[PDB]
Amino acid sequence: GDIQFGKYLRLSCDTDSETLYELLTQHWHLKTPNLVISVTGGAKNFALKPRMRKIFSRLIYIAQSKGAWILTGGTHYGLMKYIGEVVRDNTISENIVAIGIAAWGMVSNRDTLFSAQYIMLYILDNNHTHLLLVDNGCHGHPTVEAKLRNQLEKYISERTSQDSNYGGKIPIVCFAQGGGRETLKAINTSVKSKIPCVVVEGSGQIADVIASLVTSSMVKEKLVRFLPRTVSRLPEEEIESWIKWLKEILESSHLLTVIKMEEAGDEIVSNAISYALYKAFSTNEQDKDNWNGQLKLLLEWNQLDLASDEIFTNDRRWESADLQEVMFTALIKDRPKFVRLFLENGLNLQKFLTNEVLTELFSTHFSTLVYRNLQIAKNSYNDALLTFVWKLVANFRRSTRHPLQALFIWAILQNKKELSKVIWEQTKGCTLAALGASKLLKTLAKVKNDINAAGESEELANEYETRAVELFTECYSNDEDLAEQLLVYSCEAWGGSNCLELAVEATDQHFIA
C-alpha cells in the first residue's frame, strides 16, 4: 500500500536485505553517506524535556547536512512522533530520508491496495517519508521489526562506499536514548556488531544506567535505582537475562560513547557521533596504523581539538608532503580552523599554491553566480582594480606572481570571513591588501542584486578597513618614517596603486583622517 499526502510497503521476514537495499537505492532513495537509527521505546509515554528536544533537533540538522538516512519505529507515539514533526519543519524551512520500521500486525487500521489512501494499536505516523511494515509471522503483533532492522544495518555496514572517506565504509551510528527493554536488546545486538554508537545520561533511564556503569550486584542495584517499579514488575529469570545483556554490553566500551549531562554546548551532539565513529575507525585495527584516513575523517566532521591532540604530536613525524592533500580539501570544505592548524604545523603555503592548483581551483570552484556578478560589474561599471582582478580570474579560469594575493581574492569573492582573515595573516602587503579587499567588496556590493548579501559584504568591508586602520596606527606609532615609506610604497602589481590611492578611491574617510 502506497500512501501520499510517502511510499509504504508490506514485507516478509524472509525478504533478503540486499533486495530491499537495491529497491530503495535504485529509484526513490539516493545513496546514503551515513545512517542514524533512533532506539526508543514504542510506549506512548514520552517527555519533551527542553534538553532532549534541542538534542534531537540538532541531530536532525546534522542528518540533513550529511544527507544521512534516519531509521525509527515510526508508530506515531512519543519520541518518534516528535521526530516526524521536526523533519516536517525542516522541509518547510534538499531532502531528508526518515525511514520508519513497524510491524503490520501491530497496526490498528489496514487498507490493502492508483495509490490507496487511508486517513485515521500503534497507528503509523504520517510525517515519515517512507515506512516499512513486516509481520510475515506472529500475526498478534509481537516484536518482529527489530530483527529485520538489525539485518539491514548489518548489510549496510558490509557495503563499500566509493567517496565515504571513512575507510570505504558507512558509519552506522545507533543513537539511543530509550528506556525500554527492546532498546536494551537493540543496543546489545548492535554492539555485538562493529557498530559504535551513543547514549545520553538524560531522560532515558536505562541510558542513565549504562552511563553510570561506564559486578552483577552493582549493575542490579543501579537498575533497581533507575527502575524501581519496572524492576519490581519484571520476573526473576527475565531480569537475570537483563543483567546478562547489560554485562555483555558493558564488556565493550570503545564502541560505546556517552553524552555528559553537564555539557550544554550547541555542538555537543555532533562531537559525540564524531568521536564514536573516530574510535571505531581507529580501534578497529583495520586502519589503526593508518594516518591519512584518520585525519580526513576528523576533517570531515568539524573536530579540530581532537585532531590536534591525536593526529599530531611529536611521535608520528608526519612530514610536509602528506599535509598538502588535506589542506586542499580543507580549502573547499570551508574549515578555516583546520587551515590555520595545517599552516602552523609546518605546511609551506608558498610552495602549495601551484599554477595547476590555482587553475583547477578557480575553474571548478568559483561560484557561477559570483562569476556572473563579477562579469556584469566589470562590463558595466569598470574600475582600475576591477580590470586587474577580472584579467587575473579569466587567466586562471581559461588556463612576481603573488599567488597569496590570488588565494586571498578567491576567498574574498566567495564571502568567507575566517578563511579570508587566515589568508590575510600570511600576505606581505597586509595593509594594502586590506584596503584593496574593502574597495573590491564595496564595488561588488554596488552591483549586487542580493539584498542581505550586500549587507554582509558591507560589514566585511567595514571590518577589513577597521583592521587596516588599526594596523597602520600601530605601525606608525612604532616608527614615523618607515610608516610613511610604506604609505608611498608603490604596489608591485597588486592593483598598481598604493594605500593612499586605494583609500581615496574607496572613500575611506576614517583611514585618511
Binding site: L9, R10, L11, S12, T15, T19, L23, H27
Partner: peptide, 11 residues
C-alpha cells in the same frame, strides 16, 4: 513497472 517489481520481489 515499479509496482510490478515490488510485487514480484514481495511475492
Amino acid at each position: 513497472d515499479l509496482v510490478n517489481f515490488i510485487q514480484a520481489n514481495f511475492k
